[PDB]
Structures are given as C-alpha cells and as structure tokens.
Design a binder for these strands. Structure first.
Ligand SMILES: [Mg+2]
Ligand SMILES: [Mg+2]
Ligand SMILES: [Mg+2]
Ligand SMILES: [Mg+2]
Ligand SMILES: [Mg+2]
Ligand SMILES: [Mg+2]
Ligand SMILES: [Mg+2]
Ligand SMILES: [Mg+2]
Ligand SMILES: [Mg+2]
Ligand SMILES: [Mg+2]
Ligand SMILES: [Mg+2]
Ligand SMILES: [Mg+2]
Ligand SMILES: [Mg+2]
Ligand SMILES: [Mg+2]
Ligand SMILES: [Mg+2]
Ligand SMILES: [Mg+2]
Ligand SMILES: [Mg+2]
Ligand SMILES: [Mg+2]
Ligand SMILES: [Mg+2]
Ligand SMILES: [Mg+2]
Ligand SMILES: [Mg+2]
Ligand SMILES: [Mg+2]
Ligand SMILES: [Mg+2]
Ligand SMILES: [Mg+2]
Ligand SMILES: [Mg+2]
Ligand SMILES: [Mg+2]
Ligand SMILES: [Mg+2]
Ligand SMILES: [Mg+2]
Ligand SMILES: [Mg+2]
Ligand SMILES: [Mg+2]
Ligand SMILES: [Mg+2]
Ligand SMILES: [Mg+2]
Ligand SMILES: [Mg+2]
Ligand SMILES: [Mg+2]
Ligand SMILES: [Mg+2]
Ligand SMILES: [Mg+2]
Ligand SMILES: [Mg+2]
Ligand SMILES: [Mg+2]
Ligand SMILES: [Mg+2]
Ligand SMILES: [Mg+2]
Ligand SMILES: [Mg+2]
Ligand SMILES: [Mg+2]
Ligand SMILES: [Mg+2]
Ligand SMILES: [Mg+2]
Ligand SMILES: [Mg+2]
Ligand SMILES: [Mg+2]
Ligand SMILES: [Mg+2]
Lengths: 129, 123
RNA sequence: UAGCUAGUAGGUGGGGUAACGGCUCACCUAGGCGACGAUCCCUAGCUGGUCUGAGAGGAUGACCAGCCACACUGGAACUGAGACACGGUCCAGACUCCUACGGGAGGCAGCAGUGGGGAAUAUUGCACAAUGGGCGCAAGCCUGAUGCAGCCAUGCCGCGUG
RNA sequence: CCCGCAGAAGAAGCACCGGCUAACUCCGUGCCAGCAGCCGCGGUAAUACGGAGGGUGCAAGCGUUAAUCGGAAUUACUGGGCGUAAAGCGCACGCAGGCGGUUUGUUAAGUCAGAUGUGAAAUCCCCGGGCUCAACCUGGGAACUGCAUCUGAUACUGGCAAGCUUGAGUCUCGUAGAGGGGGGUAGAAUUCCAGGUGUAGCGGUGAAAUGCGUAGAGAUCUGGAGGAAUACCGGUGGCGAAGGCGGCCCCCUGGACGAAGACUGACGCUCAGGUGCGAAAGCGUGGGGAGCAAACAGGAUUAGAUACCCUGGUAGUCCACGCCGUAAACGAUGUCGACUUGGAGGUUGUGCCCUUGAGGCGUGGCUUCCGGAGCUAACGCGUUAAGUCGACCGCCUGGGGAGUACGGCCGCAAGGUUAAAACUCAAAUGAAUUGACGGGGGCCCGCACAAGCGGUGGAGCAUGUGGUUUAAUUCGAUGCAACGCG
RNA sequence: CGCUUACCACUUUGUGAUUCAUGACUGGGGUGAAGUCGUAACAAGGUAACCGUAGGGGAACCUGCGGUUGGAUCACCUCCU
RNA sequence: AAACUGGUA
RNA sequence: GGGAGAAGGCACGCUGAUAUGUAGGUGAGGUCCCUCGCGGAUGGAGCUGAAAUCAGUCGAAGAUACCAGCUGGCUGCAACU
C-alpha cells in the first residue's frame, strides 16, 4: 500500500526527468503544493497547477537545460520509517551550498538557506541538486 | 538490514582469538623441554628441523622450534619461549629464545647477534 | 535461562529509627514483577578520564582526582555526634608461635623488607626545614601523610661522544 | 647556578639490504645446513641460508615477543549485501509489534526557538607567563556536544473530535477453467483361468545364456475373472497461495475475471512467536494386488562386477483412516504499493461502427518471446525488472570441521527443528577470454583406410644395438624422430 | 547477678540441580611424499549429473520412487507460395 | 562388445 | 498410568477459653396454610456433637499398652494377575 506520498512525488519527478517528459500527473496535497512552491522559487520547475474539487490533481512542469535536466539528483531524507530533525547551528547543505534542502520549520516549509537565516530548524524533507 | 531489525537485534562485532595462546597474554613463558623431536616439513620444503615439546610452568604441552645452528637442549632443561610460528611445521606456534636460561647462544655468529643471543666480540 | 514471587503486593492498628518506609509485628484483601527480557547462570569496582580513529565508533579504567566496598574467615554489638571500627571489643573457625604443660599470644590488601608465584616490578634510607593534619592558650610533641634522597634506559625531553 | 686549571683527552651501538620496502657484490654450502610477517628461497654460478666488503634506517638506544585501535566500507547508524560468488523461510492465514490515503478544528506529546540552573577540579584545545630550550609547571578563555525547569512557535509526526472517496470491501447480471471432496459408469490394452485349431520352436541380446515348450509352447479364435491408467483432443493451453491438478456423467463446494449501477467510509500493508496446507520415499491398522519394480535368485559381460544388460521377483506403487513435514519444494528471484520508450504472439471478457466477411477502431485480466534507457563483475534482467522509490519481514559475514556434537522441542520409528566449539589451510568461489582435450557435431586432406603387388616376422649369413662376460670389451645416439646411427 | 523465651554464626543429616576435572573402552574429524585396492566426478567422463527418501554392497558407490538443468546430439529430398 | 592407470617437486 | 507410602521432615497426653458445648446433625412446643390432614411452610426448645487456635500443666518418654511397612543402589530371568 501507499506509505509515503512525498517519496512518490520525488520518484515521479526523477522518473520524468530521466524520461525527458513535459509535465507530470499526481494527486495534490498540502506538502506536495508547499514543496512545489519551494521548487518553483528555486528554479527547478517552470510551474505547477492544481485543479479539481472532489479529486484534486497536481501537475508539475519540468525544466531542461540545452541538453540536460535541471534536477541533477533528488532523494528523500526523513523517511517515514526513520525521521530526522536537525539543530539550528548545524543544518545540511547540498553540494557545499550549491544545492538546497527542503526543511519543514515551524514557520512553514522553506529551503535550508532561508531556515538558517530565519534562525529555526526543523524536519529535513529532501535534498535537491 | 532495516533499522527496525537492527533495533530489535544490534550488529555483533566479529570475535577474535590469539594464534599463540600462552595463558593470559604473556610475552614469554618458561618450560622444561619434555623431549626433543626432529620432524619433516610440508611438500615444497625438504629439511629436518629441531623441535621440542615444552611443558609451561603454569600452562600446557606445546611444541616449540629451536632456531639457529646447533643447541644444547636435552631431556629436562628450563628454557623461555616466545610467540611466532613455523609455517612448514604444523602444530608449532612458538620459538625457543636462544641465549636465555639454560639455552645457549649460537656459535660463531657475526650477523644478527641480538637475535640468537650471541655476545659481541669484545675489542 | 520463560515464567518468578507469602512479608510477597496493598490497607488498618501497634511497635521501632535522627528521619519516611513491611523497617518489624497482629489482622484484612490477592495481589506484585515479566517479552520494553522478570527469574536463573557467567563475568566485572563505577566515573572525570586514557589509547586509537577524519568523524561516528572500538578498546580500556595503570598514575592523578571524585564515589563505592573490604581489612586472616564468619557473626554481633558496645563506646561515640559520627563505626557495626585497618594498627578497638566479644564469640566461633583455619593456621602459626611461647610454655615451668597449669596456661597464653598473633593478624603488613600502612612504610621498608623476607619467603613463595611469575617473563616481570625498587631502600629493612634522611627530615618534620616547607604544606597539611591530631592535642595544646602558647612554647611544643606526634605525623613511613608529606618533602627529599637511594635502585631501574621503564617512558618523554635535552646535551655530548669534538 | 657562576668561576678557574689541564687536556681530543673519558663517552656508539642495534637492525636491515628478493618484492611489499630505503639500501649489492664476492666466497662457503648444495632441498643439507638453514631462513621465513605474506608471496616463498636452498637439490654446485643463491642479490632470500652462513661469512666478508659495501650500503640503507634509527641512535643511547636498536630489535623481537605480548596487547588495543587503524588500515578493515571485513557487522556497513554515518557506511554493505542475498538470480549464478555466503545469503528469500516450501507456501499461506494471522496476534503482539512496525508503518499508514485525504479536509478542517483542537491539544502541544514528539519536534524547533529563547532564558535560567547545572555539567567538580585535573586532563584535551587557543592565547600568554616561568624553569638557560624542550619535556615539565602555570594565568585566562573555550570546550565540557549532556541533563532539568520555565517561557513561546504549530510546518511535519502523535493524541482527541468531525468529514470525504481515489486504498480496501459488499451487492446485481455474465464468462472461462485437469480448482477441491464424494458417488457412478464406458472403451482400449496387459495379465490370468476354461475351451477350440495347430506344432516346433518361443523369448531375449551388440552376440548369448538363463527361462518357457512334445506332460503340446509360441501364434490364432471363443468365453470369463480381476487390478490399474485414461491413448489424439493436448497447445511459446488452462486452474490453484504453494505442493499440484487431464476418459465421461451426477451431487456438494472454493477462487478468479468482465459490464455498468448502488452501498460502507481508511475498515489498510507487513508480520517475530503461533496455526494450517505441504511431491516422492517412509511408518501403523485393515483391504486389494493386473502391470511395474528396491531387496533377493539365476544367466551374461569383465582381470574382478555383491553394477550397467537379460530372465524371474518380495516390500512398495492402489484404497480408507492416522503419522512423517522433508526435495535442484527453482523463476536458485519475499510480500504490498507507485513511476518509467516499444515490437511480435497466445488465452479469456467487453464497447462503437460504413455493422456485408474468419472484418475496422478501443478498452480490461492472465500469459510467451525479442529488445531501448537504466542496472549489473559479467552472463544477463528489462512495464510480469535484476530500472527509480516507499513499508515490513527473513537471511549472509573465508574454505573445511558442520547443518555436525551437546542441550531443548516434536515423532511409533526412520529422523525432523534450533544450533556450537576445538582444530586445520591460504586460499575456497562467481562470470568471462585464449589455448588444449572430448569414447560431441559438421566439412576437408595424406599409400590413412579400402582395392592390388611385393615384403618382414620362419632358415643360413652380413651388420648395428641391448644384455652378459672380459684386462679392456673407448665415447656418444634411445618411441615415432636410436639401433648398416657419429 | 543468676535463670528463662525470641533472633542468629559455626556445625551436622537427607535428597536434588548445575559446573570443572579425570576414566578402561569406543565413534567420527584433521594433517602427513613418494604404501595397498579400485576409478566415483570433471568431455555424452564412456550407465548424464545432482536433490530428497528407501534398500544393498571392501571402497569410492549401485538400484528403486519423485523432482531439477546447474544437459551434449534430430519433422532424412516428401509440404506451404 | 569391450576400452584401467600414469610417484614427488 | 506409574515409580510413590519413593526418600525425608513437623505435630500428637491432660486442663481452660474462644464457645457456661463452636461448625454440623437431629428436632418438640407455638403460628400460618386447609392443598383434604401418616399433609405443607415457618419456627426453633430439647438432644447429640467433631475439627482447629491460644494459654497453662505432668512425666525420661503422650501413634505411651495390644495391633502396626525396614529402606536405598547395580544386575540375570520371566512382560504382568
Ligand atoms: Mg504503620
Ligand atoms: Mg523503602
Ligand atoms: Mg576508521
Ligand atoms: Mg567499562
Ligand atoms: Mg550510641
Ligand atoms: Mg580503628
Ligand atoms: Mg597492620
Ligand atoms: Mg608492604
Ligand atoms: Mg620465581
Ligand atoms: Mg633523545
Ligand atoms: Mg629496493
Ligand atoms: Mg656460491
Ligand atoms: Mg569498521
Ligand atoms: Mg559485501
Ligand atoms: Mg519462494
Ligand atoms: Mg498476510
Ligand atoms: Mg498521515
Ligand atoms: Mg512538546
Ligand atoms: Mg617561554
Ligand atoms: Mg592550564
Ligand atoms: Mg572539567
Ligand atoms: Mg495532526
Ligand atoms: Mg464475497
Ligand atoms: Mg514464521
Ligand atoms: Mg506414498
Ligand atoms: Mg502402508
Ligand atoms: Mg498393506
Ligand atoms: Mg530387473
Ligand atoms: Mg531446505
Ligand atoms: Mg515442483
Ligand atoms: Mg521448475
Ligand atoms: Mg532457497
Ligand atoms: Mg530481454
Ligand atoms: Mg541435526
Ligand atoms: Mg538434537
Ligand atoms: Mg602419392
Ligand atoms: Mg591395405
Ligand atoms: Mg630371420
Ligand atoms: Mg663425456
Ligand atoms: Mg657403446
Ligand atoms: Mg650416456
Ligand atoms: Mg568415471
Ligand atoms: Mg557417468
Ligand atoms: Mg539433508
Ligand atoms: Mg592404481
Ligand atoms: Mg551373571
Ligand atoms: Mg512370573
């Protein structure tokens, strides 16, 4: 059965990038839309759209450089069977700061840079590079 | 192995045992040289060698190898043994310490005297 | 090593301790612990720390410092503010020693030192001059704590052998 | 601590030099003596043994032994694996446990933020100071990654409350199927019994023999008894969780799939222990027993043959009720869920249509083959993944000893399950490459065979060799490729 | 003071459990230049091999039942268009 | 049809 | 199923109290019922009567006399009555 919609979303994004597709089809959710906004702001997707009331649906548009996918790598971190929470003074940085990490702080989800400059830690959702 | 499985049963480090069991980790031990053997090595080698069956002062029956050229160990003689094993000879995992206790040093030795326990020519 | 517990778990009253308490009695209830490992068996003084490792970890607890336990073996209590007491007491036990054979004594896991065991580990030394303790108004006395010295290339560091 | 006298006067050794690993020659020895941390050296030209010269490393030390960590990502939390190298339980159902779709409110446990208290000193680290420098001593700081309390945050996880339908499930109409249990019946064939005709063989092997037959076999025809299995259909077919399930008919009964429509509203996934099913062989009781066939007997083959072969033949194979619980129980691949280019088939449903047709266009379930990216040590897998991910469980840590011993549990027994240590070796192992070989296959050639002639091996003699003897019978050469050879 | 009751150490008896040594004899395992008998496996290893189970035999092994490939070799010119 | 075996380094 | 009464331990007399004789058994009178009376219910006088706890007490000895298993270990034979 389904156990991790966030992992499903990340896997779908990675598979779409590998297959060089235009957009993806998913069921929407609060974390899904929030991390989608975190991605748009970061430059990993053109745009995301949500539609439908009884069965909300979320569609993401992927980005490609001249011949390569923008999302070099993406993996889940705080797995459901093993969750991790980090301090403020220490927070993971992907590719020595070139990448970003999605962290669910008390003041909503945001990147590791934003969380560090705000001054509050939280649960690390995933790394994106 | 899943994290839950590891929680229920942690990883156990591989155990290790010394290849030269001489009581509780002693550097040398003295014995009485029960008897003197001369056995034969394995296939690639062909040369008889000087062996002794030593009875440790507070231990068991072990087999030790007498190095160098020539010795003076016969019947009962108190002698020290150290670690180290001879590959050719099976069951031999100890070396008699030449030039210690009743055991004498090797004659006319000019190189590596510290081993074999040979006094430097005074001059 | 899968079941273990009758003062066992709880309550009322009496007793007891400096103090709460099944700490201990009389009675009432059948409870309490255990797979998040009880009970049983083997091993072990614990820690700050030390070694190793980039880290996480692994090994370890020698010296110094904090806490615990013990003082030939088993048991008990007295005195005392504080002991169930290393150089106190009583009883019992093993061992050793003295004896005029009637009867008595002993406890270095305190500092030296001896026998023994082991591969292996030192002087039967000087001083209370300094620090610190006990008594004393003080002077002062005691202090194998302590300060020094003797032996060992056991370790780290430095110098020479031009 | 300072000063003065004299005088190089009193003060250097240990290991190693084949590769790892810095540093080479000679002599002695000749698989002996010896060396050796691993690979391994030494059987007359040793850089590996012993000595000498030379060189390298360290130095009042040097080397050996003992012990811990590291290297070892070789217990992998950081940070490993299970198709074939060790490793998926034979399969399934399920308690505890682990994890869990979506909408809002609330709590503030987990989580995060700030403050206070604490975390002895010494030790570690940073900046300084003093012993003639250093070791050593010492001032301040940092650290002391922790713990407790209080005050806040509410994104996520958890708790409580209220909802939703996409996960899961129920209802209606149909389909295919060796799904399972019980009962009945049919055809062919083998064997056996009775009878008829008939007469010298039958049978079996590579070739034989045993064996059967003139007391009439075998072959052939008629009648009868009994046991077992269902010939094609039959298939890169089907059903079942697995094991496994084929004549036909009846009764009872499980599962799967298709059409829409309605209903419940997270009711789910996984699962240690536990329970159930589980080929063949095997065991117990009672039946049955045609064929086949362990054991056993005889005949063959062979140097031997208690084997392969032949002639017989008991248990067993069959039935009912119990037990055993093991297989190369294999797809050597755990279950569940999501995503990811295609092509050619099989089997079973269903929708639209010029519907002319054994036709066009779609949509499901199961199943076979080939292949893209990707993965993989490679072979290969590849939408039915061994690709990208998530949840849980089982299992692995060099080879042998050993799935063995002891103990526990189970069984009537055979045995099953859980599961070590001592000791021994430096390997064991997987995939693939080149060669060689095969009592594998294909093609081809040579006086290779076949078809012929003439020979040798028989006799006498010449010559060479082996052996023997001798004072010496000089020394070589030895399958083809030595022997009228030097 | 003496006596007496309660607690209790040494000590004694009976019967169990567990563990360490040792024991006539006996089973299997490992190592060993160069012994004796056979040739079971690797090629189709000359009867394909192996797994479970049962019986048998100096020995490797053989045979029966089921299972696996982790096995080397084929509709003999005839038929389809 | 039969058709074994090959000391050690 | 047994072995097993395995083996081996503790208590045992008399007096008093709990209870002027308790738990228990039996059961008159009185009352009600009238089902039909050798009836039912209720009631309890009287009679009888263990076992146990606490305290005291005598003796060398309290199952005091008669009566009333000896126990354990190895092994041959036959299963057993
Ligand atoms: Mg009280
Ligand atoms: Mg208490
Ligand atoms: Mg490391
Ligand atoms: Mg410790
Ligand atoms: Mg007092
Ligand atoms: Mg005292
Ligand atoms: Mg003393
Ligand atoms: Mg002393
Ligand atoms: Mg001694
Ligand atoms: Mg120095
Ligand atoms: Mg070199
Ligand atoms: Mg030479
Ligand atoms: Mg490690
Ligand atoms: Mg690995
Ligand atoms: Mg399987
Ligand atoms: Mg299940
Ligand atoms: Mg959730
Ligand atoms: Mg909280
Ligand atoms: Mg300075
Ligand atoms: Mg300091
Ligand atoms: Mg500190
Ligand atoms: Mg919530
Ligand atoms: Mg149903
Ligand atoms: Mg299980
Ligand atoms: Mg059967
Ligand atoms: Mg049977
Ligand atoms: Mg039968
Ligand atoms: Mg036969
Ligand atoms: Mg198995
Ligand atoms: Mg099968
Ligand atoms: Mg198969
Ligand atoms: Mg398997
Ligand atoms: Mg393929
Ligand atoms: Mg077994
Ligand atoms: Mg067993
Ligand atoms: Mg020619
Ligand atoms: Mg010819
Ligand atoms: Mg001739
Ligand atoms: Mg010559
Ligand atoms: Mg000649
Ligand atoms: Mg010659
Ligand atoms: Mg063979
Ligand atoms: Mg064969
Ligand atoms: Mg087996
Ligand atoms: Mg032979
Ligand atoms: Mg007898
Ligand atoms: Mg009898």
């Amino acid at each position: 059965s389904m156990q991790d919609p966030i992992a499903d979303m990340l896997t779908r994004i990675r598979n779409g990038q590998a297959a060089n597709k235009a957009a993806v089809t998913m069921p929407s959710s609060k974390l899904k839309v929030a991390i989608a906004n975190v991605l748009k702001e970061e430059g990993f997707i053109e745009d995301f759209k949500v539609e439908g009331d009884t069965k909300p649906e979320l569609e993401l548009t992927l980005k490609y450089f001249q011949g390569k996918a923008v999302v070099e790598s993406i993996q889940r971190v705080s797995r459901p069977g093993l969750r991790i929470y980090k301090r403020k003074d220490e927070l993971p940085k992907v590719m020595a700061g070139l990448g970003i990490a999605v962290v669910s702080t008390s003041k909503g989800v945001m990147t590791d840079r934003a969380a560090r400059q705000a001054g509050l830690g939280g649960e690390i959702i995933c790394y994106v590079a | 192995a899943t994290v839950n499985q590891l929680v229920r049963k942690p990883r156990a480090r591989k155990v290790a045992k010394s290849n030269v069991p001489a009581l509780e980790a002693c550097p040398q031990k003295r014995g009485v040289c029960t008897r003197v053997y001369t056995t034969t090595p394995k296939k690639p080698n062909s040369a008889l060698r000087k062996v002794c069956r030593v009875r440790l002062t507070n231990g068991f029956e072990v087999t030790s190898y007498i190095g160098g050229e020539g010795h003076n160990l016969q019947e009962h003689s108190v002698i020290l043994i150290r670690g180290g094993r001879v590959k050719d000879l099976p069951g031999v995992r100890y070396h008699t310490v030449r030039g210690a206790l009743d055991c004498s040093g090797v004659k006319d030795r000019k190189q590596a005297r510290s081993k074999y326990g040979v006094k430097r020519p005074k001059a």
